Amino acid sequence: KPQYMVLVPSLLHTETTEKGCVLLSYLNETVTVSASLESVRGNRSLFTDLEAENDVLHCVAFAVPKSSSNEEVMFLTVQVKGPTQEFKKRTTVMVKNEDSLVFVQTDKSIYKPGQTVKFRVVSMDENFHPLNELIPLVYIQDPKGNRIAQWQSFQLEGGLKQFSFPLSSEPFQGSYKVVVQKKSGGRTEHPFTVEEFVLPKFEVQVTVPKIITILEEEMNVSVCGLYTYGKPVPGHVTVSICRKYSDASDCHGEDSQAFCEKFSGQLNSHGCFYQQVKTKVFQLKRKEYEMKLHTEAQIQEEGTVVELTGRQSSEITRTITKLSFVKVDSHFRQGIPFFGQVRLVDGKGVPIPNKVIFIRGNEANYYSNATTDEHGLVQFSINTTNVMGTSLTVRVNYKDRSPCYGYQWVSEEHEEAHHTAYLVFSPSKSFVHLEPMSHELPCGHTQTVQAHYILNGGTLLGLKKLSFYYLIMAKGGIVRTGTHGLLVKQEDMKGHFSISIPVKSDIAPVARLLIYAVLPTGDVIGDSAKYDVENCLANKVDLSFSPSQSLPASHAHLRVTAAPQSVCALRAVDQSVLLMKPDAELSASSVYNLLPEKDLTGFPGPLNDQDNEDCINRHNVYINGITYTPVSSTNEKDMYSFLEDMGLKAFTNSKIRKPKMCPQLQQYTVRKYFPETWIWDLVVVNSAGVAEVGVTVPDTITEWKAGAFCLSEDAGLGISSTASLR
């Protein structure tokens, strides 16, 4: 039969371009497709067309303008017109007047009187290419619900802008804010504190279990106070390790603090302080809650004490000896072995070597033992010729918290590997599952996934070879595409075949890969995938500087590498207030999680689905053989479902959805210059990378948090590192 298949994310980011793909094959090549995205109420119509041939995949990037409403539904219809054939299919598409993803960045986190705040604002689109645009409003707000400053109706040209504002000599103190308001009515915020303070010149730091468990008699602890240029500081230390939530009333003057154990130390001249403590005073049990550790270094010749709050959430967990999954096929099939790789860990997060375990695959009757290796890994394999849905578990101990679980006053547990899997519907009895590299996915690199394709009978009549078609989906849309044909064995089942693909960039921190093979009889198979793409950007960027120097040693440099025609936002800051209080979510991870709709998975709410009509329900179910027996709905995975949790929707004629029957009809020498900032500027990257000359501030000694935020229309944005200049 002649075959088509047209695919598109169920969502539509408007005012921009969005990609959608089409496949065609097997006769009457001279075909014309046309997508019509139409506003039902009142009327709008955006028309797109293409002419195509057989045995080709191709993707068109159609654009969408703004609308009246913020978010709407639209009837998307598609018409296929071959010289001797016609087909039409429609559905509902979610259109949305997307809000550009925007943000702020300050010079500093806190502020003192008499100074001037200085910040910058940025905006971008789905693609992180920069975007020039008029902003309605930004303003600075004073803690009393009152305002202190405001700017309105201003256009970004470099995709960013900078502002400043001076503070009085006696304003209000506390948590001031800055806020932006967009034309959509969307608002965003970036706080910052304002108050008097002193400039620190050291930082305490503890070492201790970030995670402490029940079966703990003692604890390593150590106190190391970094100084200017990370040098050792002498003086006194005192830690207060602490348990919380004792039997106190947390009221009537009753301190909720449980046992707080205090350890002193004379912080030596060289090196750092240590202490090994005993947890018997803590009673690591049911009704003594998490562990807070407050370490207070009093630096000598100043009397100056500073504290660090640490490891508050040391997970004193009931679940001990917790094993894990790593790479579990969510699914299995009636004609295949699936093999789950499964690591084992406990407690801290360290795998145990050489430890027997038991593995129960229920409704495969696969009760098999194994053991933990140096990496705690086991790659159990299970043949699958069995019933509908399978359950799997693994343990190191048995199905109960063996030592004293029934008291109501107990505190202990052990994890159990639990997992369930469903099979595909494949009426052909052929299918293509994939073996992925299902773990962390690096960037800027190629990777090969492998595929276990199998073909019941191969092509029944068809032709010689066959074709596979894969799509790599990103940021809820589309990014990459390709295909691969192969000569089939004459009537046989060929198992293995690989696919390599690049991981340059331009892809969400998730990468939703799928593939699907097509059969001229009107049949089809395929299977999805998921890769945790490491947070990584297209436009590479880097920084450097002419190295550290002495005190007034003015002449210094900074350098940056980026795309050959771009800009960069350069935040050198004296790292003392930042030592005092950190920055706020400034990273590629910031960019990534600021994104709207990380993953398109499943259609939205307002649209439910598209139904079909086939009801195979017999009068009596016609269950020949020994006996008769009634009807019921299944529960299993589907290609329609594969493309649903993929995130997108498509039109075709082939059997994609399972033939769900219809329900039952039955019813009833030096001069100080400004600290707390060194450099706060914009710069341009030529086609050779930039190098500016910074000017060594005097009378100040700490880290120098250099921050590079670059931007070009072609390569997008870039985030360079925390280069110091000690």
């Binding site: 019509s36 039409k88 439910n608 009809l665």
Partner: protein
């Protein structure tokens, strides 16, 4: 709602009955919202029963009522939008959407449940909304209608009336002057016209067996279908002509004669559609400002008569005899306000 409009268009109303009806309308509206589906669809029970799906004809009926109710009182567009996209979702590629039968009674609906008639009632309920013929859903609808019409026309039977009439009304709502012309011609062929009026009926003796009490499981639905026939006659793109108005007059005479002393008509559907039809008739014919009509009859044997018609005598039947054997009676009307002239 349709009797509200009848009262307001004939002008026999008051703010008291108005306000009471308005309260009824809001109450029934909300009590109906208490039966719908989360997708926007509508069911008899619906809410408090998660495992369910709504019905199509019922969703369409509520849509039409929401339409005219918006026309009088306030109502939100989101509900009609959601039910509308739901109507779309059920549609097939070229075939029309199915019947997701989830009703309790066949009396409430006057049609035969056929996909043809069902889709006809649906698409016409759509077109009562101001809806472009260029819309996709309606485009496919008209495709269905044309196909079904040809099948029933070239065929010796497609029920001969009710199908054909509903098709006629929808084709009129389209813009297909020629198509509505041919179909109304065909319906006019199979006439149940009488001494001073016209109407239509089902076969009057079904070929297969029937029940006992009032033809149970068969409301016989003559008033509603005649009303839709009428409605089809009443709608042209600039304004209707004379001859459609004469046919409308005759069938309306039959209608008003077929009204029940209890009030309404033999059911709720036929009552609704009949009142809609009469409302549109009066909107065409019953002018509230045209109040100076003058009629002058003149016959070659110098037999001349004169009459006046104004608001005060709006309901007056001025009758006069006519003695001459060879009748060549020239009527001449002037001024404003329509007049019916029944001679025997």
């Amino acid at each position: 709602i349709y009797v509200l409009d009848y009262l307001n268009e004939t002008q026999q109303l008051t703010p008291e009955i108005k306000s009471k009806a308005i309260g009824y309308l809001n109450t029934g509206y909300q009590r109906q919202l208490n039966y719908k589906h989360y997708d926007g669809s509508y069911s008899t029970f619906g809410e408090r029963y998660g495992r369910n799906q709504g019905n199509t004809w019922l969703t369409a009926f509520v849509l039409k009522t929401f339409a005219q109710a918006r026309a009088y009182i306030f109502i939100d567009e989101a509900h009609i939008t959601q039910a509308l996209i739901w109507l779309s979702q059920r549609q097939k590629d070229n075939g029309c959407f199915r019947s997701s039968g989830s009703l309790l009674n066949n009396a409430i609906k006057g049609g035969v449940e056929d996909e043809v008639t069902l889709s006809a009632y649906i698409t016409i309920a759509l077109l009562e909304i101001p809806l472009t013929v260029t819309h996709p859903v309606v485009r496919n609808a008209l495709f269905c209608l044309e196909s079904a019409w040809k099948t029933a026309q070239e065929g010796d039977h497609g029920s001969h009336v009710y199908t054909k009439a509903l098709l006629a009304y929808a084709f009129a709502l389209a813009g297909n002057q020629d198509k509505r012309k041919e179909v109304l011609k065909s319906l006019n062929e199979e006439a149940v016209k009488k001494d001073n009026s016209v109407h239509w009926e089902r076969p009057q003796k079904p070929k297969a067996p029937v029940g006992h009490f009032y033809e149970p499981q068969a409301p016989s639905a003559e008033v509603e279908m005649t009303s839709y026939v009428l409605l089809a006659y009443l709608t042209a793109q600039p304004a209707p002509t004379s001859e459609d108005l004469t046919s409308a007059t005759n069938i309306v005479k039959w209608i008003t004669k077929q009204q029940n002393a209890q009030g309404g008509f033999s059911s709720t559907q036929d009552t609704v559609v009949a009142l809609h039809a009469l409302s549109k008739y009066g909107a065409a014919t019953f002018t509230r400002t045209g109040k100076a009509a003058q009629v002058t009859i003149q016959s070659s044997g110098t037999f001349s008569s004169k009459f006046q018609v104004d608001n005060n005598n709006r309901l007056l039947l001025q009758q006069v005899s006519l003695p001459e054997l060879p009748g060549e009676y020239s009527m001449k009307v002037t001024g404003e306000g329509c007049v019916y002239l029944q001679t025997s």
